[PDB]
Protein backbone atom coordinates (compact mmCIF):
# COMPACT_ATOMS: atom_id res chain seq x y z
CA UNK A 1 0.00 0.00 0.00
CA UNK A 2 2.30 2.75 1.34
CA UNK A 3 5.24 4.18 -0.71
CA UNK A 4 8.63 4.49 1.03
CA UNK A 5 8.71 8.29 0.85
CA UNK A 6 5.28 8.47 2.50
CA UNK A 7 6.42 6.19 5.33
CA UNK A 8 9.52 8.39 5.80
CA UNK A 9 7.21 11.45 6.09
CA UNK A 10 5.01 9.68 8.67
CA UNK A 11 8.14 8.92 10.71
CA UNK A 12 9.01 12.58 10.65
CA UNK A 13 5.55 13.39 12.05
CA UNK A 14 6.04 10.72 14.69
CA UNK A 15 9.45 12.17 15.63
CA UNK A 16 7.90 15.62 16.10
CA UNK A 17 5.00 14.37 18.25
CA UNK A 18 7.47 12.37 20.36
CA UNK A 19 9.68 15.48 20.78
CA UNK A 20 6.71 17.54 21.86
CA UNK A 21 6.27 14.98 24.67
CA UNK A 22 10.03 14.98 25.46
CA UNK A 23 12.63 17.03 23.54
CA UNK A 24 15.29 14.31 23.78
CA UNK A 25 12.92 11.33 23.54
CA UNK A 26 15.50 9.02 21.90
CA UNK A 27 17.87 9.51 24.78
CA UNK A 28 15.13 9.08 27.44
CA UNK A 29 12.89 6.35 25.96
CA UNK A 30 13.87 2.67 25.67
CA UNK A 31 12.99 -0.13 23.28
CA UNK A 32 11.02 -1.85 26.10
CA UNK A 33 8.94 1.34 26.54
CA UNK A 34 7.67 1.11 22.96
CA UNK A 35 7.20 -2.66 23.25
CA UNK A 36 5.12 -2.11 26.42
CA UNK A 37 3.04 0.63 24.80
CA UNK A 38 2.24 -1.67 21.90
CA UNK A 39 1.31 -4.53 24.23
CA UNK A 40 -1.11 -2.23 26.06
CA UNK A 41 -2.67 -0.89 22.86
CA UNK A 42 -3.09 -4.39 21.52
CA UNK A 43 -5.37 -5.27 24.42
CA UNK A 44 -7.45 -2.15 23.67
CA UNK A 45 -7.75 -3.40 20.12
CA UNK A 46 -8.95 -6.83 21.27
CA UNK A 47 -11.44 -5.25 23.63
CA UNK A 48 -13.25 -4.00 20.47
CA UNK A 49 -14.39 -7.61 19.85
CA UNK A 50 -16.85 -9.88 21.66
CA UNK A 51 -14.10 -12.22 22.88
CA UNK A 52 -15.55 -12.64 26.39
CA UNK A 53 -17.62 -15.78 26.89
CA UNK A 54 -19.13 -14.49 30.14
CA UNK A 55 -20.20 -10.96 29.20
CA UNK A 56 -22.22 -9.23 26.47
CA UNK A 57 -22.72 -12.37 24.42
CA UNK A 58 -23.48 -11.82 20.75
CA UNK A 59 -22.24 -8.20 20.83
CA UNK A 60 -20.87 -7.20 17.43
CA UNK A 61 -17.29 -6.00 16.96
CA UNK A 62 -16.66 -2.25 17.35
CA UNK A 63 -14.89 -2.11 13.95
CA UNK A 64 -14.90 1.73 13.97
CA UNK A 65 -12.89 1.73 17.23
CA UNK A 66 -10.56 -0.89 15.71
CA UNK A 67 -9.42 1.74 13.20
CA UNK A 68 -8.29 3.97 16.02
CA UNK A 69 -6.52 1.23 17.97
CA UNK A 70 -4.66 0.13 14.87
CA UNK A 71 -3.41 3.68 14.32
CA UNK A 72 -2.33 3.92 17.99
CA UNK A 73 -0.22 0.76 17.53
CA UNK A 74 1.20 2.30 14.37
CA UNK A 75 2.34 5.42 16.25
CA UNK A 76 4.18 3.25 18.82
CA UNK A 77 5.62 0.96 16.12
CA UNK A 78 7.02 3.85 14.09
CA UNK A 79 8.49 5.10 17.36
CA UNK A 80 10.05 1.75 18.26
CA UNK A 81 11.49 1.40 14.73
CA UNK A 82 13.36 4.67 14.94
CA UNK A 83 14.34 3.90 18.56
CA UNK A 84 15.94 0.74 17.09
CA UNK A 85 17.59 2.65 14.23
CA UNK A 86 19.08 4.98 16.89
CA UNK A 87 20.25 2.16 19.18
CA UNK A 88 23.95 1.37 19.07
CA UNK A 89 24.53 -2.16 17.67
CA UNK A 90 25.99 -3.46 21.02
CA UNK A 91 22.83 -2.35 22.85
CA UNK A 92 20.44 -4.19 20.47
CA UNK A 93 18.65 -6.90 22.43
CA UNK A 94 19.15 -10.55 21.44
CA UNK A 95 15.41 -11.22 20.93
CA UNK A 96 15.43 -8.79 18.00
CA UNK A 97 18.45 -10.49 16.30
CA UNK A 98 17.48 -14.17 16.81
CA UNK A 99 15.33 -16.12 14.35
CA UNK A 100 11.71 -15.10 14.76
CA UNK A 101 10.61 -18.76 15.24
CA UNK A 102 12.94 -19.03 18.28
CA UNK A 103 11.42 -16.00 20.19
CA UNK A 104 7.74 -16.44 19.20
CA UNK A 105 5.01 -19.11 19.14
CA UNK A 106 2.67 -18.21 16.23
CA UNK A 107 -1.10 -18.35 16.92
CA UNK A 108 -3.53 -19.45 14.21
CA UNK A 109 -7.32 -19.30 13.96
CA UNK A 110 -9.13 -22.68 13.93
CA UNK A 111 -11.16 -21.91 10.77
CA UNK A 112 -9.51 -21.53 7.35
CA UNK A 113 -8.73 -17.89 6.53
CA UNK A 114 -6.71 -15.41 4.45
CA UNK A 115 -3.44 -14.12 5.92
CA UNK A 116 -1.37 -10.99 5.54
CA UNK A 117 1.98 -11.63 3.68
CA UNK A 118 3.84 -12.65 6.89
CA UNK A 119 2.29 -15.51 8.88
CA UNK A 120 0.69 -13.24 11.57
CA UNK A 121 -2.68 -11.50 10.96
CA UNK A 122 -5.87 -13.14 9.69
CA UNK A 123 -8.96 -12.16 7.60
CA UNK A 124 -11.60 -11.04 7.62
CA UNK A 125 -10.99 -9.00 10.80
CA UNK A 126 -14.75 -8.85 11.21
CA UNK A 127 -14.08 -12.30 12.75
CA UNK A 128 -13.32 -12.33 16.47
CA UNK A 129 -11.19 -15.48 16.28
CA UNK A 130 -9.01 -13.97 13.52
CA UNK A 131 -8.52 -10.79 15.60
CA UNK A 132 -7.54 -12.74 18.73
CA UNK A 133 -4.84 -14.76 16.98
CA UNK A 134 -3.72 -11.62 15.12
CA UNK A 135 -3.04 -9.53 18.21
CA UNK A 136 -1.63 -12.24 20.44
CA UNK A 137 0.97 -12.47 17.63
CA UNK A 138 1.39 -8.66 17.60
CA UNK A 139 2.23 -8.68 21.32
CA UNK A 140 4.84 -11.35 20.68
CA UNK A 141 6.28 -9.29 17.74
CA UNK A 142 6.44 -6.30 20.16
CA UNK A 143 8.19 -8.46 22.79
CA UNK A 144 10.72 -9.47 20.08
CA UNK A 145 11.10 -5.77 18.91
CA UNK A 146 9.84 -6.44 15.36
CA UNK A 147 8.39 -2.96 14.98
CA UNK A 148 8.84 -2.95 11.17
CA UNK A 149 6.96 -6.23 10.97
CA UNK A 150 4.16 -4.81 13.08
CA UNK A 151 4.00 -1.84 10.69
CA UNK A 152 3.38 -4.19 7.67
CA UNK A 153 0.72 -6.10 9.57
CA UNK A 154 -1.20 -2.87 10.35
CA UNK A 155 -1.24 -1.85 6.62
CA UNK A 156 -2.77 -5.21 5.68
CA UNK A 157 -5.30 -5.04 8.53
CA UNK A 158 -6.32 -1.59 7.26
CA UNK A 159 -6.65 -2.98 3.73
CA UNK A 160 -9.00 -5.78 4.96
CA UNK A 161 -11.14 -3.60 7.22
CA UNK A 162 -11.43 -1.28 4.21
CA UNK A 163 -10.20 1.98 5.77
CA UNK A 164 -7.53 4.54 4.95
CA UNK A 165 -4.69 3.94 7.39
CA UNK A 166 -2.67 7.08 6.61
CA UNK A 167 -5.70 9.40 6.88
CA UNK A 168 -6.59 7.90 10.25
CA UNK A 169 -2.94 8.27 11.34
CA UNK A 170 -2.89 11.98 10.61
CA UNK A 171 -6.21 12.52 12.40
CA UNK A 172 -5.02 10.74 15.57
CA UNK A 173 -1.57 12.30 15.30
CA UNK A 174 -3.33 15.65 15.38
CA UNK A 175 -5.46 14.60 18.36
CA UNK A 176 -2.32 13.43 20.18
CA UNK A 177 -0.83 16.88 19.67
CA UNK A 178 -4.08 18.44 20.88
CA UNK A 179 -4.04 16.36 24.09
CA UNK A 180 -0.45 17.51 24.92
CA UNK A 181 -1.51 21.16 24.45
CA UNK A 182 -4.58 20.61 26.66
CA UNK A 183 -3.14 19.18 29.89
CA UNK A 184 -2.81 15.44 29.14
CA UNK A 185 0.44 15.34 31.20
CA UNK A 186 -0.92 17.15 34.31
CA UNK A 187 -4.28 15.38 34.34
CA UNK A 188 -6.55 18.27 33.32
CA UNK A 189 -7.54 16.95 29.89
CA UNK A 190 -11.25 15.91 29.57
CA UNK A 191 -10.88 12.85 27.31
CA UNK A 192 -14.51 11.79 27.71
CA UNK A 193 -16.20 15.23 27.56
CA UNK A 194 -19.96 15.11 28.11
CA UNK A 195 -20.06 11.30 27.61
CA UNK A 196 -18.37 11.46 24.20
CA UNK A 197 -14.89 10.02 23.60
CA UNK A 198 -12.36 12.33 21.79
CA UNK A 199 -11.28 9.56 19.39
CA UNK A 200 -14.95 9.21 18.29
CA UNK A 201 -14.83 12.67 16.63
CA UNK A 202 -12.01 11.65 14.27
CA UNK A 203 -14.12 9.64 11.82
CA UNK A 204 -15.99 12.68 10.43
CA UNK A 205 -12.60 14.43 10.04
CA UNK A 206 -11.50 11.79 7.41
CA UNK A 207 -14.71 11.22 5.31
CA UNK A 208 -13.51 13.73 2.65
CA UNK A 209 -10.05 12.07 2.10
CA UNK A 210 -9.30 9.48 -0.63
CA UNK A 211 -6.73 6.67 -0.73
CA UNK A 212 -4.92 8.11 -3.78
CA UNK A 213 -4.85 11.67 -2.29
CA UNK A 214 -3.19 10.78 1.03
CA UNK A 215 -0.38 8.74 -0.62
CA UNK A 216 -0.03 10.68 -3.90
CA UNK A 217 3.52 12.10 -4.12
CA UNK A 218 2.25 15.55 -5.18
CA UNK A 219 -1.08 15.69 -3.30
CA UNK A 220 -0.20 14.14 0.09
CA UNK A 221 0.92 17.31 1.92
CA UNK A 222 -2.24 19.31 1.09
CA UNK A 223 -4.43 16.29 1.98
CA UNK A 224 -2.68 15.75 5.33
CA UNK A 225 -3.02 19.47 6.09
CA UNK A 226 -6.79 19.33 5.45
CA UNK A 227 -7.20 16.34 7.85
CA UNK A 228 -5.11 18.25 10.37
CA UNK A 229 -7.29 21.35 10.06
CA UNK A 230 -10.50 19.23 10.24
CA UNK A 231 -9.29 17.71 13.52
CA UNK A 232 -8.12 21.04 14.98
CA UNK A 233 -11.46 22.59 14.00
CA UNK A 234 -13.36 19.66 15.54
CA UNK A 235 -11.66 20.45 18.91
CA UNK A 236 -12.02 24.23 18.64
CA UNK A 237 -8.17 24.75 18.58
CA UNK A 238 -6.99 28.34 17.98
CA UNK A 239 -4.99 28.93 14.76
CA UNK A 240 -1.81 29.86 16.65
CA UNK A 241 -1.70 26.52 18.53
CA UNK A 242 -1.84 24.49 15.27
CA UNK A 243 0.99 23.03 13.17
CA UNK A 244 0.95 21.91 9.52
CA UNK A 245 2.89 19.11 7.87
CA UNK A 246 5.64 21.39 6.54
CA UNK A 247 6.13 22.62 10.04
CA UNK A 248 6.48 19.05 11.42
CA UNK A 249 8.88 18.25 8.55
CA UNK A 250 10.90 21.39 9.39
CA UNK A 251 11.12 20.49 13.06
CA UNK A 252 12.29 16.99 12.13
CA UNK A 253 14.88 18.31 9.59
CA UNK A 254 16.48 20.50 12.30
CA UNK A 255 16.19 17.79 14.96
CA UNK A 256 18.28 15.65 12.53
CA UNK A 257 20.81 18.55 12.34
CA UNK B 258 1.53 -18.97 52.13
CA UNK B 259 -1.40 -21.17 51.01
CA UNK B 260 -1.82 -24.82 52.18
CA UNK B 261 -2.57 -27.46 49.52
CA UNK B 262 -6.03 -28.28 50.88
CA UNK B 263 -6.98 -24.59 50.77
CA UNK B 264 -5.85 -24.31 47.14
CA UNK B 265 -7.90 -27.44 46.30
CA UNK B 266 -10.97 -25.75 47.90
CA UNK B 267 -10.39 -22.55 45.88
CA UNK B 268 -10.28 -24.66 42.71
CA UNK B 269 -13.61 -26.14 43.63
CA UNK B 270 -15.05 -22.62 43.95
CA UNK B 271 -13.52 -21.73 40.60
CA UNK B 272 -15.04 -24.85 39.00
CA UNK B 273 -18.49 -23.89 40.28
CA UNK B 274 -18.28 -20.28 39.07
CA UNK B 275 -17.07 -21.52 35.67
CA UNK B 276 -19.99 -24.00 35.50
CA UNK B 277 -22.46 -21.26 36.33
CA UNK B 278 -21.14 -19.47 33.21
CA UNK B 279 -21.24 -22.70 31.14
CA UNK B 280 -22.31 -26.12 32.52
CA UNK B 281 -19.73 -28.01 30.45
CA UNK B 282 -17.00 -25.35 30.56
CA UNK B 283 -14.11 -27.86 30.29
CA UNK B 284 -15.50 -29.21 27.07
CA UNK B 285 -16.23 -25.73 25.61
CA UNK B 286 -13.27 -23.64 26.85
CA UNK B 287 -9.69 -23.97 25.53
CA UNK B 288 -6.26 -23.43 27.03
CA UNK B 289 -5.80 -20.38 24.74
CA UNK B 290 -9.03 -18.87 26.16
CA UNK B 291 -7.57 -18.83 29.68
CA UNK B 292 -4.20 -17.61 28.36
CA UNK B 293 -5.99 -14.74 26.56
CA UNK B 294 -8.04 -13.84 29.62
CA UNK B 295 -4.88 -13.63 31.70
CA UNK B 296 -3.13 -11.48 29.08
CA UNK B 297 -6.06 -9.06 29.13
CA UNK B 298 -6.20 -8.90 32.92
CA UNK B 299 -2.49 -8.31 33.11
CA UNK B 300 -2.86 -5.09 31.13
CA UNK B 301 -5.58 -3.96 33.57
CA UNK B 302 -3.13 -4.62 36.36
CA UNK B 303 -0.44 -2.51 34.69
CA UNK B 304 -2.91 0.29 34.06
CA UNK B 305 -2.99 0.71 37.89
CA UNK B 306 0.53 2.21 37.67
CA UNK B 307 1.85 5.50 36.27
CA UNK B 308 3.70 3.77 33.43
CA UNK B 309 2.73 6.33 30.78
CA UNK B 310 5.35 8.99 30.08
CA UNK B 311 2.88 11.21 28.23
CA UNK B 312 -0.11 11.26 30.58
CA UNK B 313 -0.82 11.93 34.27
CA UNK B 314 2.83 12.30 35.22
CA UNK B 315 3.64 11.71 38.87
CA UNK B 316 0.31 9.93 39.52
CA UNK B 317 0.70 7.37 42.31
CA UNK B 318 -0.05 3.68 41.79
CA UNK B 319 -3.64 2.54 42.44
CA UNK B 320 -2.42 -0.23 44.79
CA UNK B 321 -5.99 -0.91 46.02
CA UNK B 322 -7.09 -1.72 42.44
CA UNK B 323 -3.98 -3.90 42.06
CA UNK B 324 -5.44 -6.25 44.68
CA UNK B 325 -8.50 -6.78 42.53
CA UNK B 326 -6.58 -7.30 39.29
CA UNK B 327 -4.32 -9.83 40.95
CA UNK B 328 -7.34 -11.81 42.12
CA UNK B 329 -8.86 -11.67 38.60
CA UNK B 330 -5.65 -13.20 37.19
CA UNK B 331 -5.84 -15.83 39.92
CA UNK B 332 -9.37 -16.83 38.88
CA UNK B 333 -8.21 -17.32 35.26
CA UNK B 334 -5.02 -19.12 36.33
CA UNK B 335 -6.88 -21.60 38.53
CA UNK B 336 -9.16 -22.13 35.55
CA UNK B 337 -6.30 -22.67 33.10
CA UNK B 338 -4.61 -25.10 35.53
CA UNK B 339 -7.62 -27.36 35.72
CA UNK B 340 -8.19 -26.95 31.95
CA UNK B 341 -4.64 -28.34 31.62
CA UNK B 342 -5.26 -31.14 34.12
CA UNK B 343 -8.33 -32.09 32.02
CA UNK B 344 -6.49 -31.91 28.67
CA UNK B 345 -5.53 -35.25 27.14
CA UNK B 346 -1.71 -35.60 27.01
CA UNK B 347 -1.66 -35.62 23.12
CA UNK B 348 -3.53 -32.30 23.06
CA UNK B 349 -1.07 -30.53 25.41
CA UNK B 350 0.63 -27.74 23.48
CA UNK B 351 4.41 -27.86 22.97
CA UNK B 352 5.02 -24.44 24.58
CA UNK B 353 3.85 -25.85 27.92
CA UNK B 354 6.21 -28.90 27.72
CA UNK B 355 9.39 -27.16 26.45
CA UNK B 356 12.00 -25.61 28.74
CA UNK B 357 10.71 -22.31 30.05
CA UNK B 358 13.88 -20.47 28.85
CA UNK B 359 13.12 -21.59 25.25
CA UNK B 360 9.53 -20.11 25.14
CA UNK B 361 10.11 -16.94 27.21
CA UNK B 362 12.47 -13.93 27.40
CA UNK B 363 12.58 -12.88 31.10
CA UNK B 364 12.27 -9.13 31.83
CA UNK B 365 14.16 -7.56 34.73
CA UNK B 366 13.91 -4.15 36.40
CA UNK B 367 16.97 -1.86 35.99
CA UNK B 368 17.32 -1.15 39.74
CA UNK B 369 18.31 -3.85 42.24
CA UNK B 370 15.27 -5.51 43.85
CA UNK B 371 13.84 -8.51 45.72
CA UNK B 372 12.28 -11.29 43.65
CA UNK B 373 9.61 -13.91 44.24
CA UNK B 374 11.07 -17.51 44.41
CA UNK B 375 10.93 -18.00 40.61
CA UNK B 376 12.77 -15.40 38.51
CA UNK B 377 9.59 -13.45 37.50
CA UNK B 378 8.02 -10.84 39.84
CA UNK B 379 9.85 -7.99 41.59
CA UNK B 380 9.55 -5.99 44.87
CA UNK B 381 8.36 -3.73 46.19
CA UNK B 382 5.33 -3.63 43.85
CA UNK B 383 4.85 -0.03 44.93
CA UNK B 384 7.52 0.47 42.22
CA UNK B 385 6.21 0.99 38.69
CA UNK B 386 9.32 -0.49 37.04
CA UNK B 387 9.05 -3.68 39.14
CA UNK B 388 5.36 -4.03 38.18
CA UNK B 389 6.06 -3.57 34.46
CA UNK B 390 8.72 -6.29 34.33
CA UNK B 391 6.55 -8.50 36.56
CA UNK B 392 3.50 -8.50 34.29
CA UNK B 393 5.27 -8.60 30.96
CA UNK B 394 6.65 -11.88 32.37
CA UNK B 395 3.15 -12.97 33.48
CA UNK B 396 1.85 -12.54 29.92
CA UNK B 397 4.69 -14.68 28.65
CA UNK B 398 3.93 -17.35 31.35
CA UNK B 399 0.28 -17.25 30.15
CA UNK B 400 1.40 -17.63 26.51
CA UNK B 401 3.47 -20.68 27.62
CA UNK B 402 0.49 -22.07 29.70
CA UNK B 403 2.35 -21.95 33.04
CA UNK B 404 -0.82 -21.35 35.03
CA UNK B 405 0.61 -23.01 38.19
CA UNK B 406 3.63 -20.74 37.99
CA UNK B 407 1.38 -17.71 37.65
CA UNK B 408 -0.50 -18.87 40.75
CA UNK B 409 2.77 -18.85 42.84
CA UNK B 410 3.70 -15.42 41.55
CA UNK B 411 0.32 -13.97 42.63
CA UNK B 412 0.74 -15.33 46.22
CA UNK B 413 4.12 -13.60 46.51
CA UNK B 414 2.79 -10.37 45.02
CA UNK B 415 0.00 -10.45 47.62
CA UNK B 416 2.58 -11.05 50.37
CA UNK B 417 4.60 -7.96 49.26
CA UNK B 418 1.64 -5.63 48.78
CA UNK B 419 0.57 -6.76 52.26
CA UNK B 420 -2.97 -7.99 51.51
CA UNK B 421 -4.90 -11.19 52.08
CA UNK B 422 -5.10 -12.93 48.70
CA UNK B 423 -7.62 -15.62 49.66
CA UNK B 424 -10.02 -13.15 51.30
CA UNK B 425 -9.93 -10.95 48.21
CA UNK B 426 -10.47 -14.05 46.03
CA UNK B 427 -13.65 -15.01 47.86
CA UNK B 428 -14.98 -11.44 47.70
CA UNK B 429 -14.43 -11.19 43.92
CA UNK B 430 -15.61 -14.77 43.39
CA UNK B 431 -18.83 -13.71 45.06
CA UNK B 432 -19.07 -10.57 42.90
CA UNK B 433 -18.49 -12.69 39.79
CA UNK B 434 -21.43 -14.86 40.80
CA UNK B 435 -23.49 -11.73 41.46
CA UNK B 436 -22.75 -10.35 37.97
CA UNK B 437 -23.93 -13.61 36.29
CA UNK B 438 -27.20 -13.44 38.29
CA UNK B 439 -27.67 -9.78 37.31
CA UNK B 440 -27.45 -9.80 33.50
CA UNK B 441 -23.69 -9.68 32.82
CA UNK B 442 -24.19 -12.01 29.80
CA UNK B 443 -27.08 -10.06 28.17
CA UNK B 444 -25.63 -6.61 28.81
CA UNK B 445 -28.05 -5.35 31.47
CA UNK B 446 -25.61 -5.32 34.40
CA UNK B 447 -24.72 -1.79 35.70
CA UNK B 448 -21.02 -2.31 36.54
CA UNK B 449 -20.38 1.38 37.18
CA UNK B 450 -23.61 2.27 39.06
CA UNK B 451 -23.89 5.96 39.93
CA UNK B 452 -20.17 6.58 39.16
CA UNK B 453 -18.98 3.87 41.56
CA UNK B 454 -17.25 0.71 40.33
CA UNK B 455 -18.58 -2.64 41.72
CA UNK B 456 -15.07 -3.92 42.51
CA UNK B 457 -14.53 -0.82 44.71
CA UNK B 458 -17.13 -2.09 47.24
CA UNK B 459 -15.17 -5.29 47.92
CA UNK B 460 -12.50 -3.76 50.18
CA UNK B 461 -14.91 -3.04 53.07
CA UNK B 462 -16.22 -6.62 52.73
CA UNK B 463 -12.74 -8.02 53.76
CA UNK B 464 -11.60 -5.62 56.58
CA UNK B 465 -12.89 -8.05 59.27
CA UNK B 466 -10.97 -11.15 57.94
CA UNK B 467 -7.52 -12.26 59.20
CA UNK B 468 -4.75 -14.17 57.42
CA UNK B 469 -4.86 -17.10 59.87
CA UNK B 470 -8.71 -17.32 59.72
CA UNK B 471 -9.02 -17.62 55.92
CA UNK B 472 -6.37 -20.40 55.66
CA UNK B 473 -6.95 -22.15 59.01
CA UNK B 474 -8.00 -25.77 58.36
CA UNK B 475 -10.88 -25.55 60.88
CA UNK B 476 -11.87 -21.88 60.51
CA UNK B 477 -11.64 -21.31 56.73
CA UNK B 478 -15.20 -22.33 55.75
CA UNK B 479 -16.91 -20.03 58.29
CA UNK B 480 -14.55 -17.16 57.34
CA UNK B 481 -15.19 -17.60 53.61
CA UNK B 482 -18.95 -17.71 54.27
CA UNK B 483 -18.77 -14.39 56.18
CA UNK B 484 -16.90 -12.69 53.27
CA UNK B 485 -19.49 -14.15 50.93
CA UNK B 486 -22.37 -12.80 53.00
CA UNK B 487 -20.64 -9.38 53.34
CA UNK B 488 -20.38 -9.16 49.55
CA UNK B 489 -23.94 -10.37 48.92
CA UNK B 490 -25.19 -7.87 51.52
CA UNK B 491 -23.14 -5.07 49.92
CA UNK B 492 -25.02 -5.70 46.61
CA UNK B 493 -28.45 -6.14 48.21
CA UNK B 494 -28.72 -9.82 47.02
CA UNK B 495 -31.77 -11.76 48.27
CA UNK B 496 -31.02 -14.77 50.53
CA UNK B 497 -32.42 -17.28 48.02
CA UNK B 498 -30.00 -16.16 45.25
CA UNK B 499 -26.92 -16.73 47.48
CA UNK B 500 -24.65 -19.77 47.79
CA UNK B 501 -22.27 -20.71 50.62
CA UNK B 502 -18.96 -22.55 50.43
CA UNK B 503 -20.44 -25.95 51.32
CA UNK B 504 -22.85 -25.49 48.49
CA UNK B 505 -20.02 -24.71 45.99
CA UNK B 506 -18.10 -27.73 47.35
CA UNK B 507 -21.22 -29.90 46.89
CA UNK B 508 -21.73 -28.75 43.33
CA UNK B 509 -18.07 -29.51 42.56
CA UNK B 510 -18.23 -32.98 44.25
CA UNK B 511 -21.18 -33.98 42.01
CA UNK B 512 -19.66 -32.35 38.92
CA UNK B 513 -16.67 -34.69 39.58
CA UNK B 514 -19.16 -37.63 39.75
Ligand SMILES: O=c1ccn([C@H]2C[C@H](O)[C@@H](COP(=O)(O)NP(=O)(O)OP(=O)(O)O)O2)c(=O)[nH]1
Nearest residue numbers: 017018021044071072075076079172176311312
Ligand atom coordinates in the same frame (compact mmCIF):
# COMPACT_ATOMS: atom_id res chain seq x y z
O1 LIG C 1 5.72 9.17 23.16
C1 LIG C 1 4.51 8.94 22.66
C2 LIG C 1 3.50 8.66 23.60
C3 LIG C 1 2.22 8.50 23.13
N1 LIG C 1 1.98 8.56 21.80
C4 LIG C 1 0.62 8.37 21.30
C5 LIG C 1 0.41 7.23 20.36
C6 LIG C 1 -1.03 6.81 20.51
O2 LIG C 1 -1.84 7.14 19.35
C7 LIG C 1 -1.47 7.56 21.72
C8 LIG C 1 -2.17 6.73 22.78
O3 LIG C 1 -2.43 7.55 23.93
P1 LIG C 1 -3.30 6.94 25.19
O4 LIG C 1 -3.01 5.46 25.23
O5 LIG C 1 -2.96 7.81 26.33
N2 LIG C 1 -4.95 7.07 24.92
P2 LIG C 1 -5.83 6.30 23.73
O6 LIG C 1 -5.91 7.20 22.50
O7 LIG C 1 -5.41 4.82 23.37
O8 LIG C 1 -7.23 6.16 24.55
P3 LIG C 1 -7.21 5.38 26.01
O9 LIG C 1 -6.92 6.38 27.13
O10 LIG C 1 -8.60 4.80 25.95
O11 LIG C 1 -6.09 4.31 26.11
O12 LIG C 1 -0.34 8.10 22.35
C9 LIG C 1 2.98 8.87 20.91
O13 LIG C 1 2.72 8.89 19.70
N3 LIG C 1 4.23 9.05 21.34
Ligand SMILES: O=c1ccn([C@H]2C[C@H](O)[C@@H](COP(=O)(O)NP(=O)(O)OP(=O)(O)O)O2)c(=O)[nH]1
Nearest residue numbers: 054055274275278301328329332333336429433
Ligand atom coordinates in the same frame (compact mmCIF):
# COMPACT_ATOMS: atom_id res chain seq x y z
O1 LIG D 1 -15.22 -18.40 32.84
C1 LIG D 1 -14.89 -17.40 33.65
C2 LIG D 1 -15.03 -16.11 33.11
C3 LIG D 1 -14.77 -15.05 33.94
N1 LIG D 1 -14.34 -15.27 35.20
C4 LIG D 1 -14.06 -14.13 36.08
C5 LIG D 1 -12.66 -14.03 36.61
C6 LIG D 1 -12.40 -12.57 36.87
O2 LIG D 1 -12.33 -12.26 38.29
C7 LIG D 1 -13.57 -11.91 36.22
C8 LIG D 1 -13.23 -10.77 35.28
O3 LIG D 1 -14.43 -10.30 34.65
P1 LIG D 1 -14.37 -8.97 33.68
O4 LIG D 1 -13.00 -8.96 33.05
O5 LIG D 1 -15.58 -9.07 32.83
N2 LIG D 1 -14.47 -7.55 34.56
P2 LIG D 1 -13.37 -6.98 35.67
O6 LIG D 1 -13.75 -7.47 37.06
O7 LIG D 1 -11.84 -7.22 35.35
O8 LIG D 1 -13.61 -5.39 35.42
P3 LIG D 1 -13.42 -4.79 33.89
O9 LIG D 1 -14.75 -4.88 33.14
O10 LIG D 1 -12.94 -3.42 34.27
O11 LIG D 1 -12.41 -5.60 33.05
O12 LIG D 1 -14.25 -12.85 35.43
C9 LIG D 1 -14.26 -16.54 35.71
O13 LIG D 1 -13.84 -16.70 36.87
N3 LIG D 1 -14.51 -17.59 34.94
Ligand SMILES: [Ca+2]
Nearest residue numbers: 040041044072
Ligand atom coordinates in the same frame (compact mmCIF):
# COMPACT_ATOMS: atom_id res chain seq x y z
CA1 LIG E 1 -4.09 3.52 25.02
Ligand SMILES: [Ca+2]
Nearest residue numbers: 041044069072
Ligand atom coordinates in the same frame (compact mmCIF):
# COMPACT_ATOMS: atom_id res chain seq x y z
CA1 LIG F 1 -6.08 3.37 21.99
Ligand SMILES: [Ca+2]
Nearest residue numbers: 297298301329
Ligand atom coordinates in the same frame (compact mmCIF):
# COMPACT_ATOMS: atom_id res chain seq x y z
CA1 LIG G 1 -11.17 -7.68 33.00
Ligand SMILES: [Ca+2]
Nearest residue numbers: 298301326329
Ligand atom coordinates in the same frame (compact mmCIF):
# COMPACT_ATOMS: atom_id res chain seq x y z
CA1 LIG H 1 -10.02 -6.79 36.32
